[PDB]
Design a binder for this molecule. Structure first.
Ligand SMILES: CCCCCCCCCCCCCC(=O)OC[C@H](COP(=O)(O)OCC[N+](C)(C)C)OC(=O)CCCCCCCCCCCCC
Ligand SMILES: CCCCCCCCCCCCCC(=O)OC[C@H](COP(=O)(O)OCC[N+](C)(C)C)OC(=O)CCCCCCCCCCCCC
Ligand SMILES: CCCCCCCCCCCCCC(=O)OC[C@H](COP(=O)(O)OCC[N+](C)(C)C)OC(=O)CCCCCCCCCCCCC
Ligand SMILES: CCCCCCCCCCCCCC(=O)OC[C@H](COP(=O)(O)OCC[N+](C)(C)C)OC(=O)CCCCCCCCCCCCC
Ligand SMILES: CCCCCCCCCCCCCC(=O)OC[C@H](COP(=O)(O)OCC[N+](C)(C)C)OC(=O)CCCCCCCCCCCCC
Ligand SMILES: CCCCCCCCCCCCCC(=O)OC[C@H](COP(=O)(O)OCC[N+](C)(C)C)OC(=O)CCCCCCCCCCCCC
Ligand SMILES: CCCCCCCCCCCCCC(=O)OC[C@H](COP(=O)(O)OCC[N+](C)(C)C)OC(=O)CCCCCCCCCCCCC
Ligand SMILES: CCCCCCCCCCCCCC(=O)OC[C@H](COP(=O)(O)OCC[N+](C)(C)C)OC(=O)CCCCCCCCCCCCC
Ligand SMILES: CCCCCCCCCCCCCC(=O)OC[C@H](COP(=O)(O)OCC[N+](C)(C)C)OC(=O)CCCCCCCCCCCCC
Ligand SMILES: CCCCCCCCCCCCCC(=O)OC[C@H](COP(=O)(O)OCC[N+](C)(C)C)OC(=O)CCCCCCCCCCCCC
Ligand SMILES: CCCCCCCCCCCCCC(=O)OC[C@H](COP(=O)(O)OCC[N+](C)(C)C)OC(=O)CCCCCCCCCCCCC
Ligand SMILES: CCCCCCCCCCCCCC(=O)OC[C@H](COP(=O)(O)OCC[N+](C)(C)C)OC(=O)CCCCCCCCCCCCC
Ligand SMILES: C[C@H](CCC(=O)NCCC[N+](C)(C)C[C@H](O)CS(=O)(=O)O)[C@H]1CC[C@H]2[C@@H]3[C@H](O)C[C@@H]4C[C@H](O)CC[C@]4(C)[C@H]3C[C@H](O)[C@]12C
Ligand SMILES: C[C@H](CCC(=O)NCCC[N+](C)(C)C[C@H](O)CS(=O)(=O)O)[C@H]1CC[C@H]2[C@@H]3[C@H](O)C[C@@H]4C[C@H](O)CC[C@]4(C)[C@H]3C[C@H](O)[C@]12C
Ligand code: NA
Ligand code: NA
Lengths: 230, 223, 230, 223
């Protein structure tokens, strides 16, 4: 493979650096250091004392991480952009590269996602994430079914309850949101359906069978993962 | 037979199912759009005419499917669902109640009908239900007995929650889901009836114990 | 067996009556009839119209049921009082025999328990109750453990929170009650622990580990029934 | 050895364990009674003297158990628990905090220590925990990342729920238990931050998905 390596005179030179155990260790060390520093940046008292420290520390770590991804791309070439873990690394570092201002501060908040590089860089963490994720394919049909089910009941509820209950059902999205809440069973009766039954006494004919189905499916979804994994 | 084979090759074709599924999805999209009051002031007429067109196509389709499948049609659960959900959608713009207009949205479940693999998951989910009916039966009897009890123990001083058998069923269901059962129901009940806990706690143990066994059944009965 | 039968001249006479399929059918028929009549007695409107009907119907059914248990005891003799289903039958009919007044009306309400004779008299209902119940022996240790656990944390909470929160923790029983509620996770935070953290900011150090344990055990209890039954 | 064998037969005996268990249960009963303010006005002195007597016996017991078991004692988890829970109970009537007086009730968990079969269930429950640490670790990291995010997205306008990393941890735990997460937390958050749902819904999916897999593990890993 590798098609046309960078040398392989300096290709191998940087490859042994990148491929080393020290290289991974140092990076992980910085992940943990930056994770600690990010919790510290949460205190307004710490930021009034050591604000400058952590801010420069931050931009320093991010420079190292960018160089790291660059070195890893020269070594792994095309293989890099075919590796989900490396892709996550790339995108979570790229996010972190957007200037101190501009756009919105969501990009600054999403910067904290780089701490998930602990999962990337540490094996066994990969292994558990990998195990959890591979369970998802045998769920897509049920998820698909459930999504269609929510969509149909959201449309119904929007048009049955939206005019007299705009906050909870005024809009398709509002209805989706509220139906999700009912599925988690959070205040479904005292907070949503009892108030609904004061105008619409048969509202129970809608939410109870909704609750049976959504619950029945969730149970089968779990049993699936119990059986499909066992 | 004569023209029987003629329409059968139409109905039985790959094109025929595709076109129908295409209309399911199109009509499903059109139904979400009909939710927006802004969309309906602009393209209201469009979507309304689109709707009556789709429903006419679906009616012709079911007719064609019955001529081909004859008796087999009304013995097929999927076709029956198709039939009833299209018939629902045939009820006039007014008259009766508007539940029928709302029940029209149920025709989107024809996506399940028309797409294989969706049948498969619905089929898998449903076949799990027979080995549950005895437990369901037991639970229903249990709800019935405790609903009657709650009606006559708590109904006079707590009419909204227990004044009526139906109200009691409803409240007991809520307690089973554990939703506000204490802060919202049993603590208030205990300001009048301090031993109310002797009723709802064992009720909660039983209903929970059964649900756990009901699930374990589906864990076991399906495996 | 049977030691000394009643004859067996009339012993066999009543035995064939009692042992018949008709005998069971008739009784079941009355269970269902009385169950229907009991729901009807819930309506204040029905009781103003057909109150006399159902009340006499009730005392009639109860007389038949007492005769039934009597006939069953003469036939089954000692075997009767060794049969859990017959014992339930006996006690649920005896409850139903207590006079129209006297004591409390709990005895009138407990009368509705006789509808569970549907489970007794119908096979397959026995079978599911039997299946559910037999699962309980392999649970007694965990239940025992949990009961001890609740007892210890109830004592702790009574003495940590009872003075400033008499309703929720003023008394061992109040504490038991509240801890049960926290276990069902019902309003545990917004309704109990957040108000508790306004005086006692470390209350979370008590309820969070309580919630982990009680939840962890519940999960293992279920897995037990999953494995012990599978 | 000399008197080593003399006390060993005492400590190792069936009588010795029984008497101790007998005192566990007696002291446990006495601790519930000490909860009643009425009982304490009548028999307060009795139970207090009973308490110091039991604790002195327990201290002698642990000393005797250490002379017999020597090094083996401090390598036995059950004996360590015994030791620490008795030591806790040795702290003077005042000084420090009264948490130590409350932590004294933990000595009732010596019922688990002293009664076999109780060990067995505790042992079974605990051995299940090693095959969970990776998932626990993943979840803790996940909470940490989302807590930091919530602190800086919602902390200024919602100090009580998200003003501080610790507050955010607490609130996120609550959302994970699904307790009032919508009516009590996310709907209020959405009156200021209408896209807050983009944060809590995926948070709820993940935390739930993991819990389900965590359980399935214990279903599988134990079977
Ligand atoms: C607590 C739960 C969340 C944990 C935090 C997650 C942080 C780490 C990112 C995870 C990367 C996804 C890949 C993965 O986890 O496993 C991939 C598995 C195959 O695993 P594999 O190791 O190849 O075989 C065993 O199966 C696959 O190959 C499918 C993976 C498809 C994912 C596509 C990756 C796109 C990431 C771009 C994200 C952009 C962020 C700005
Ligand atoms: C598929 C996901 C569909 C998401 C979707 O339809 O977006 C609509 C809403 C958001 O709409 P929106 O009205 O903009 O925001 C909520 C109300 N507001 C403005 C007052 C904040 O979406 C929501 O806020 C809630 C959507 C979550 C529902 C999840 C769909 C159920 C999938 C089944 C998962 C369980 C089976 C595995
Ligand atoms: C396997 C089936 C998957 C189905 C998943 C569908 C999830 C997408 C739902 C979109 C929810 C967002 C609605 C929203 O943002 O607010 C409601 C607006 C009202 O806007 P308004 O300001 O009132 O004008 O009203 C709207 O914006 C209406 C939006 C309608 C879009 C419908 C797209 C779903 C395609 C249906 C596919 C299955 C059909 C059988
Ligand atoms: C989130 C989930 C939402 C569910 C959406 C459901 C929408 C699609 C309707 C499906 C109805 C039929 C399902 C079905 O029968 O398949 C399960 C099995 C048959 O399996 P199979 O042997 O594979 O059939 C060939 O069951 C049987 O053995 C057949 C017995 C069932 C017959 C039910 C007749 C239904 C007519 C209802 C029409 C009223 C509409 C107003
Ligand atoms: C496995 C789990 C199995 C669970 C089996 C038992 C679950 C029963 C769920 C009860 C559902 C329920 O809410 O019952 C309500 C109905 C309506 O009574 P109703 O008084 O008309 O309406 C109550 C609300 N109101 C007064 C404000 C309009 O009350 C009734 O009419 C009784 C309906 C019970 C039939 C259940 C059979 C399934
Ligand atoms: C021993 C087993 C025998 C099983 C027999 C069960 C057959 C159903 C008995 C019917 C009970 C009649 C209910 C009733 O009287 O209506 C009361 C309220 C309106 O009262 P109201 O108009 O206020 O009168 C004053 O209206 C309501 O609250 C709604 C009516 C509730 C529906 C009854 C629920 C059926 C559950 C069936 C359980 C079967 C167990 C396998
Ligand atoms: C929805 C959940 C509740 C269902 C309603 C219950 C109504 C029916 C009463 C149940 C009677 C208990 C006996 C039982 O269910 O199975 C006994 C099993 C052996 O079953 P078996 O059929 O012998 O073997 C299979 O294992 C045993 O032998 C142990 C049974 C010990 C129970 C002791 C019976 C005392 C009943 C006295 C109640 C007084 C009420 C006033
Ligand atoms: C063993 C059961 C112990 C029952 C017990 O200790 O009784 C105390 C309380 C009732 O005391 P009490 O203070 O009289 O009534 C509650 C407060 N009041 C007066 C305002 C209504 O009891 C209660 O109200 C609540 C007791 C239920 C807690 C259940 C014990 C946990 C067992 C573990 C079950 C899960 C593992 C299978
Ligand atoms: C495997 C272990 C099983 C343990 C299960 C224990 C369940 C029994 C709890 C009794 C809860 C009832 C308390 C109650 O009714 O109100 C609180 C009263 C205050 O009365 P007050 O009016 O303040 O005088 O205060 C009292 O009445 C104090 C009652 C203390 C009785 C303690 C009996 C439990 C024995 C402990 C066995 C294990 C010890 C290690
Ligand atoms: C509702 C449930 C409540 C739980 C109540 C617990 C009260 C009893 C304390 C039990 C502590 C020891 C448990 C234990 O180690 O057994 C599990 C396995 C050993 O099994 P095994 O191989 O059978 O041991 C012989 O674990 C091991 O392999 C040993 C490693 C664990 C050592 C932990 C040392 C604990 C010292 C804590 C003292 C601090 C008190 C303030
Ligand atoms: C499988 C499931 C695994 C779940 C793993 C993550 C669960 C974490 C549960 C978080 C528990 C928690 O409430 O954290 C609270 C602490 C205390 O922060 P703090 O600001 O001191 O107190 C908050 C309440 N306040 C301000 C009113 C006094 O905040 C902290 O100090 C952080 C403690 C997090 C350590 C979690 C490690 C286990
Ligand atoms: C990339 C992975 C690296 C993992 C490193 C984690 C190490 C812990 C970092 C410590 C963060 C420091 C928290 C902090 O600054 O305190 C803030 C508040 C008081 O602030 P305040 O006094 O109001 O200052 C103004 O005080 C609090 O709110 C309580 C402090 C919260 C405890 C921190 C929770 C530890 C979770 C560790 C997760 C490890 C993942 C495997
Ligand atoms: C410009 C055009 C005239 C107006 C009139 C009707 C409007 C649509 C719907 O009403 C709401 C919907 C909201 C979603 O967020 C996504 C956009 C949607 C599809 C709109 C697009 C656009 O704005 C429309 C077409
Ligand atoms: C007559 C005697 C003097 C008084 C003084 C202290 C009282 C006991 C406790 O205080 C409360 C407890 C409440 C439970 O319900 C069961 C009874 C309990 C054990 C009481 C019994 C009795 O009432 C006592 C002994
Ligand atoms: Na409300
Ligand atoms: Na409160």
């Amino acid at each position: 493979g590798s098609l046309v390596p960078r040398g392989s005179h300096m290709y191998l030179r940087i490859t042994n650096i990148v491929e080393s155990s020290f290289f991974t260790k140092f990076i992980i060390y910085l992940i943990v250091l930056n994770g600690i520093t990010m919790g510290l940046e949460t205190s307004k008292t710490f930021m009034q004392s050591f604000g400058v420290y952590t801010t420069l520390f931050n931009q320093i770590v991010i420079t190292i991480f960018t160089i790291e991804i660059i070195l890893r791309i020269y070594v792994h070439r095309i293989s890099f952009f075919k590796d989900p873990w490396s892709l996550f690394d790339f995108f979570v570092v790229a996010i972190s590269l957007v200037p101190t201002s501009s756009g919105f501060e969501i990009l600054r908040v999403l910067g904290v996602l780089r701490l998930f590089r602990l999962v990337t860089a540490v094996p066994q963490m990969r292994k558990i994430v990998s195990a959890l994720i591979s369970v998802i394919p045998g769920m897509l049909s049920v998820i698909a079914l459930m999504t269609l089910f929510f969509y149909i009941f959201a449309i119904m509820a929007t048009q049955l309850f939206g005019e007299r209950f705009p906050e909870w059902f005024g809009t398709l999205g509002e209805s989706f949101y509220t139906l999700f809440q009912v599925m988690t069973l959070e205040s479904w009766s005292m907070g949503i359906v009892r108030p609904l039954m004061e105008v619409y006494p048969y509202a129970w004919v809608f939410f109870i069978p909704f609750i049976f189905v959504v619950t029945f499916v969730m149970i089968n979804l779990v049993v699936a993962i119990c059986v499909d994994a066992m």
